[PDB]
Amino acid sequence: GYSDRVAQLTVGNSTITTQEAANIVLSYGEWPEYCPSTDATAVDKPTRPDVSVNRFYTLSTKSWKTESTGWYWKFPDVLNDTGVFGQNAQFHYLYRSGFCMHVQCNASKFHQGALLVAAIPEFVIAASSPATKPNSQGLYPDFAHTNPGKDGQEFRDPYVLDAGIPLSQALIFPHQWINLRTNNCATIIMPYINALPFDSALNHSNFGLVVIPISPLKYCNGATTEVPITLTIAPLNSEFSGLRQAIKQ
Amino acid sequence: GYSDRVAQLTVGNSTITTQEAANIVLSYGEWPEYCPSTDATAVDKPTRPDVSVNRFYTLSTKSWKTESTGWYWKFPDVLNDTGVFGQNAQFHYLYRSGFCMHVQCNASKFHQGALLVAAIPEFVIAASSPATKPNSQGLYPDFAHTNPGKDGQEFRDPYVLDAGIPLSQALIFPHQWINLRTNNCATIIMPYINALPFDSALNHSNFGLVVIPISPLKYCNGATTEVPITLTIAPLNSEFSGLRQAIKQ
Amino acid sequence: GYSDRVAQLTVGNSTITTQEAANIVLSYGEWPEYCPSTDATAVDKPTRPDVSVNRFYTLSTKSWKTESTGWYWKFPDVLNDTGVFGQNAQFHYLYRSGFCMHVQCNASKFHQGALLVAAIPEFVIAASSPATKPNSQGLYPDFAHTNPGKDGQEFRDPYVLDAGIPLSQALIFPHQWINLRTNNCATIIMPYINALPFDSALNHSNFGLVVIPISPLKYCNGATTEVPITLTIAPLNSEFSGLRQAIKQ
Amino acid sequence: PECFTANGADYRGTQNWTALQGGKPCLFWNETFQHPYNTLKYPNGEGGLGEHNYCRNPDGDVSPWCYVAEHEDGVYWKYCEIPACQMPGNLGCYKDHGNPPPLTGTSKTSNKLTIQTCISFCRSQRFKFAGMESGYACFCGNNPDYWKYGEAASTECNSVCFGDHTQPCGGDGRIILFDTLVGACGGNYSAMSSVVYSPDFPDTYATGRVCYWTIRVPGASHIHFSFPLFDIRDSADMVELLDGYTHRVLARFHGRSRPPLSFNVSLDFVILYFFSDRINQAQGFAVLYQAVK
Amino acid sequence: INFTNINYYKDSYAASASRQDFAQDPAKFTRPVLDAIREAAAPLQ
Amino acid sequence: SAVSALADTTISRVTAANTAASTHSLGTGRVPALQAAETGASSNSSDENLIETRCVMNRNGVNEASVEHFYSRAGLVGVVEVKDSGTSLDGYTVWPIDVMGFVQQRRKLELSTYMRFDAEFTFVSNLNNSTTPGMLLQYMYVPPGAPKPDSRKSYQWQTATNPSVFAKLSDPPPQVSVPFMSPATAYQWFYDGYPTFGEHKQATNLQYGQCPNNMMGHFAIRTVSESTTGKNIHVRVYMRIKHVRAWVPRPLRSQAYMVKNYPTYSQTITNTATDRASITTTDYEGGVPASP
Amino acid sequence: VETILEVNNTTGTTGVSRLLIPVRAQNNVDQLCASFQVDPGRNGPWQSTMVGQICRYYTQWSGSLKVTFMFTGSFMATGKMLIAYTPPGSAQPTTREAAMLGTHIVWDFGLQSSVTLVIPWISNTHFRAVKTGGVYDYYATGIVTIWYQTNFVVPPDTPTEANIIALGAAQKNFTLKLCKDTDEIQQTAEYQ
Numbered sequence A, B, C: 001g002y003s004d005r006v007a008q009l010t011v012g013n014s015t016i017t018t019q020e021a022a023n024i025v026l027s028y029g030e031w032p033e034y035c036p037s038t039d040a041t042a043v044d045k046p047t048r049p050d051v052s053v054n055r056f057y058t059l060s061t062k063s064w065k066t067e068s069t070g071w072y073w074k075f076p077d078v079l080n081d082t083g084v085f086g087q088n089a090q091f092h093y094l095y096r097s098g099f100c101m102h103v104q105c106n107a108s109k110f111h112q113g114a115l116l117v118a119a120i121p122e123f124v125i126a127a128s129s130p131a132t133k134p135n136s137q138g139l140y141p142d143f144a145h146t147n148p149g150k151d152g153q154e155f156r157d158p159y160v161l162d163a164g165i166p167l168s169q170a171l172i173f174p175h176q177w178i179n180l181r182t183n184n185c186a187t188i189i190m191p192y193i194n195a196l197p198f199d200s201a202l203n204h205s206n207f208g209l210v211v212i213p214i215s216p217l218k219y220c221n222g223a224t225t226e227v228p229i230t231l232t233i234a235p236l237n238s239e240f241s242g243l244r245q246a247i248k249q
Numbered sequence D: 001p002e003c004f005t006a007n008g009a010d011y012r013g014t015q016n017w018t019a020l021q022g023g024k025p026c027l028f029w030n031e032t033f034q035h036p037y038n039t040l041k042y043p044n045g046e047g048g049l050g051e052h053n054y055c056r057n058p059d060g061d062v063s064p065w066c067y068v069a070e071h072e073d074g075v076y077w078k079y080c081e082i083p084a085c086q087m088p089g090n091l092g093c094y095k096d097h098g099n100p101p102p103l104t105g106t107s108k109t110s111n112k113l114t115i116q117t118c119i120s121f122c123r124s125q126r127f128k129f130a131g132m133e134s135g136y137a138c139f140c141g142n143n144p145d146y147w148k149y150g151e152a153a154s155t156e157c158n159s160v161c162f163g164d165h166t167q168p169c170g171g172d173g174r175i176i177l178f179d180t181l182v183g184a185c186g187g188n189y190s191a192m193s194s195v196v197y198s199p200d201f202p203d204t205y206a207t208g209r210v211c212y213w214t215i216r217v218p219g220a221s222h223i224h225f226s227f228p229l230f231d232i233r234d235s236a237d238m239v240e241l242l243d244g245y246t247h248r249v250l251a252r253f254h255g256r257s258r259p260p261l262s263f264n265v266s267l268d269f270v271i272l273y274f275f276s277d278r279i280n281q282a283q284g285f286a287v288l289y290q291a292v293k
Numbered sequence E: 001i002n003f004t005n006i007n008y009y010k011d012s013y014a015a016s017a018s019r020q021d022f023a024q025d026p027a028k029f030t031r032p033v034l035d036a037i038r039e040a041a042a043p044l045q
Numbered sequence F: 001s002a003v004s005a006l007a008d009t010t011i012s013r014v015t016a017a018n019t020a021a022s023t024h025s026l027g028t029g030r031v032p033a034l035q036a037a038e039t040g041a042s043s044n045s046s047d048e049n050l051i052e053t054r055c056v057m058n059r060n061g062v063n064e065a066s067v068e069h070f071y072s073r074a075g076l077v078g079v080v081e082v083k084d085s086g087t088s089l090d091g092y093t094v095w096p097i098d099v100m101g102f103v104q105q106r107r108k109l110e111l112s113t114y115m116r117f118d119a120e121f122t123f124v125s126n127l128n129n130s131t132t133p134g135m136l137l138q139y140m141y142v143p144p145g146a147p148k149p150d151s152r153k154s155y156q157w158q159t160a161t162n163p164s165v166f167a168k169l170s171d172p173p174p175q176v177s178v179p180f181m182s183p184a185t186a187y188q189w190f191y192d193g194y195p196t197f198g199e200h201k202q203a204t205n206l207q208y209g210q211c212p213n214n215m216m217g218h219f220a221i222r223t224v225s226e227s228t229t230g231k232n233i234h235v236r237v238y239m240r241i242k243h244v245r246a247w248v249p250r251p252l253r254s255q256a257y258m259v260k261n262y263p264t265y266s267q268t269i270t271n272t273a274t275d276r277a278s279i280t281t282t283d284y285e286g287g288v289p290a291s292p
Numbered sequence G: 001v002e003t004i005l006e007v008n009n010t011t012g013t014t015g016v017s018r019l020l021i022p023v024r025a026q027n028n029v030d031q032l033c034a035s036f037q038v039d040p041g042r043n044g045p046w047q048s049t050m051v052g053q054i055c056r057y058y059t060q061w062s063g064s065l066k067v068t069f070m071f072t073g074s075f076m077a078t079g080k081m082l083i084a085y086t087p088p089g090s091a092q093p094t095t096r097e098a099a100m101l102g103t104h105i106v107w108d109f110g111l112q113s114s115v116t117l118v119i120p121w122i123s124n125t126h127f128r129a130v131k132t133g134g135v136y137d138y139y140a141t142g143i144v145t146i147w148y149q150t151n152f153v154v155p156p157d158t159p160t161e162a163n164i165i166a167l168g169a170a171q172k173n174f175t176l177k178l179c180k181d182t183d184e185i186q187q188t189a190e191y192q
Ligand SMILES: CCCCCCCCCCCCCCCCCC(=O)O
Pocket: F097, F098, F099, F100, F119, F121, F139, F140, F141, F163, F164, F165, F176, F178, F181, F187, F188, F189, F214, F215, F216, F219, F261
């Protein structure tokens, strides 16, 4: 009737071991599933390259600092140029997949801090601008902020999630904390959420992956200053339809 | 009890229609099959990207001339940089697949000529050199002749298949003629032949694909001079194991 | 499960043999029938001169040229002065009949071109006029264009069928192509279509019979220049009521 | 002609009114501190702004605008319908009602459409006119009657081009028509007065343009060459006024060679030359010649 | 609970539209031929 | 009882054709792609037999493409101005009933050759300034042969047998159900013939295509007034075609109409398709190719 | 019902010639014969089709399309064409090697003179808006390009340029939605 602190996540040829894990958040209680015949609309037979694309891709490592605001990734965009997933995402017009997001941040028992690892469906990034005409560039975020790639994007205003919504209510989304005294990893299994059965992996980013320090990383002199935060994600039940020439963006 | 001249070959999203077809050569009476558990040695789960790689790739068009000697391709090498097959062939160490080679050469009822379309397993290309020391470069074929790519390689001595073996006995291999008065296509379905269940798609070329004009293309003035020869091949039952970084050559 | 290229159409003392026939279009899936008692309104006993009027009348031969626009006939009008059908059509006020339109155009295997043989119910012929007052003569077609007789009428604007409707959608009507590489005849069996069970063969033309060259007749020097197009039609289930003095127009 | 740019970001023309008739007055720039564009955030010029209520385009919008008194429902600015701000190649904003189109010809929808990508599309097919509409639609035609549905206010064609949001590309049912000579890589100019532009003028001139404009007024004595716009800030990219019969350089202009107000020539046959490096492309130039018989 | 398609007048043509008899028979326009041609078969053999 | 009928009154969803799962086919004699368009038959090739398809249990409703739903929509069929001001102090107007005066209704009707239908005619009447003062109007249907009114006071407005609707402008739009009124089994938007016998050698030839089976009389509208009202009333007639039976589908009109009762196109023929630069030029930019 | 696609909707081409896809003997290999977008309601070749005109009376469409190409050359004219449907996201393929990566059919001219290329319903949404252009290229259907798989080979004394007639129609799973008013004919005055 409890959650075991040890966990092993084996997907494909990738395996993730954690010895200080809180639990595994199954987003909205729904495992990732393949598109049923009732919900499908595209007639082409989808490709399900099970083990070549459904596997853990360690994508980015961000150095947690005392004044760090946080980072966000867009799930399809963060894997669109990586591995056989990226190739299928480029060669195919349609794509659907869940994911198993695994954020890793280990620190000594003398460090402190708390990250909020949340998976935000349809994470539309806002721009912070003064009162200006709709002609103004500052009213709308550039592409580097909407699709940060694999490197992610440092939050400008994590208090409002760079979306005008309060960070305090970001816990309405499938979330997990990395409290350094408690756990060093946060696992979120997110099913494919979209008003469409399939969608373009290049145009549309289904989920945002926010890692925001709520309690700032504090430690004493002599502790290891560099405390990294690693994002390992794994597609789950990846389908691809609409084969054509490979399209980058 | 006869072979119908019309044929349609539907593999993946590709479909090949022919209205003047001799038959379909099933090489050695064996359809391409996936590697059984008894014959397999690699323990990794193979990827079988059925419709993304098993499909007709129209790869090369060679202009048949009166003095043309012939052309040869190496089946894995001819697809190693094309489509999702090439990507799987580069990302995976191991590969096995049959193919459905479809050579197309149409000409008017006033043209004449006969091609020999044969699929030669382990088509080791020979070099034609004078009596020289083993130090000599001419004793061994360069890589452009061993792995001609998708463009193929024009035969230097089609009489000996550039292999020291008489072309007249090349009919011991799975073959088909394109006799311009009879048919305009030659289809050969070749199963995976190798002393190994899987093999490197980059190092090892399992089959050679020779198209040699035995009866030279003759026509009269006013007929269409350009008489092309098109090679459309389709992998069949393609497996790939040993995922790693993509390796070109 | 196929259409035999040979066909013989025996109606009355007329027989039409074709050895390169596509099929026989049964217009709207309805064979010509005699007027049932439920649909009839006229009380006089109709005359059904079966074999004297229901027979193939070869009516017109038009020379297909490279710049030819096409020709159209009006089915009752094209037979109103021919044979015992014409006499019954003149002596009787009421008339109803289907027809078996058979267009014939044979050319060598070195000719090319494609006719669109369509049977258009209620083929109201339009006039092509500049913006003018309703007093203007050009706004309305003369009688030679509305009822061309047996000679037919050369299309002025076959692109719009001389009716303001696009020729490209004329395939919504019971149609058949004469593709010179494929067939030399087009047969359309059209039932009597009218909002009335019977109608005047002189005033009302139930169907138009268009023969438009879509792909222009091209050939090389030495081929037979004169490539005729012959219209043989046969009334089917011809009834005539309302006997009186013979009326021409 | 007061404006020689597509967006009106060259207008200094003394119009303190949204429209010449039936509009709203403009708020002074030295008094509009409630808003981003004023004389405090832009001290020295910086967009024709100053101590005046004149319409300006400092933000690179599609048309010269001005701040209006915010009363209606928060509308605190309005585009100015400056009739003299029409680009010398801009034939106007016209209505598009239906299927007999203003420009009967070829069409093109481009999510990267600019004014020049439409003109270049029409010029490649020997069309005289190029009409942008709805920000993405491009229409070509030789129709001298593109006004068959009546003219429209320039502000009715203020939809941003999908490829360059600083340029007007028409609107819903409104088509902005340009003469396809604008931004051509050369051409023959036999006319009294014409405003020859840089290659691909509403956009930035491409890298590697070697263009030759033939300006021969058959009967003129002097040609008054004026440059109302010379955003040619670079070194290799130069604009030369080569002679005619002799093909000799008469005046070479580049970054630190900005042209005089009138480099008049006594030859009735001048060849406007343009050069472009492989890098450092700028907004271009807009020359204006006036032949005096 | 649906309460519609009710005629309040003695004349049947005063009723609402007949929107419950969707029938699709395209063969009279798409395959108006005498010889039924199988899909897998070459039509003109 | 009949409560079972009231239960099955909502429109049931008829779905589109499902796609079956298909595999690869490598053989001879089976050519579902090869067709013969000369036969006049559309291709019977299915998606399953040309590509490897999946199982798509299609639930898209095809019910809206019915002839009833396509036609049961009130469109403008007539604008009748009851002129009672200025030079035209009539106070009445007799309007020839024709549904081919406006392009939107006319083009939809001419999709079919014969149409047998009942109609729901609605009259949306108002002044020039869009206002609807209480002003009594009389919309009298004058069938073919009934005497047409020649004034606002004439005896024909007694409507002892003619159908007539009295409604003020302030009332909601008068709406009536018109049956299938025609001597023929169906109306005929295209009549390849002449109404009368004869030679038809007139310079104008106005009678071609004029079928009196469609001429259903006049709509006489008057202000119920004793003198001039000084106000012109614009009566817009909207016809909703119900109980539709369509026959012989036709190509949709491509040329702009020029007259009401005749197909007549300009000498400047407009192409059905808009012109493009070349037969190999498509204006779809797509995305950036991975490796050109 | 299959109706003629106006694929030769080019400047200068007038009349019935706009309904023909010209095919001729090529001096080079792997060349492009013709291309056209497969958006039924887009101003282009599909306007000439019954499906493309009935689509315009509706806002959203769904289902597979079908283009039956009929070769109208001489019996002695032989040739193989690659007709490829490129799903959305890609522009018109610049080479046949790029086009053969999509849904394609290799058409062999012969006794059967017609080939059918099904444009499969490859869409992210259940329906595509009939309106195209601008942000509505989200509902782009794709591009159909006709390539010379082999040449157009003819014997002597035979025409070297023939025509392919495209016949566009809708598959059995075709569906329309949200009846609207077409934008095909405009009216400025009541027809008198
Ligand atoms: C009280 C007012 C009642 C209104 C009576 C309206 C009667 C309408 C007649 C039915 C309309 C359909 C037939 C129209 C055919 C005419 C078109 C034509 O062929 O020119």
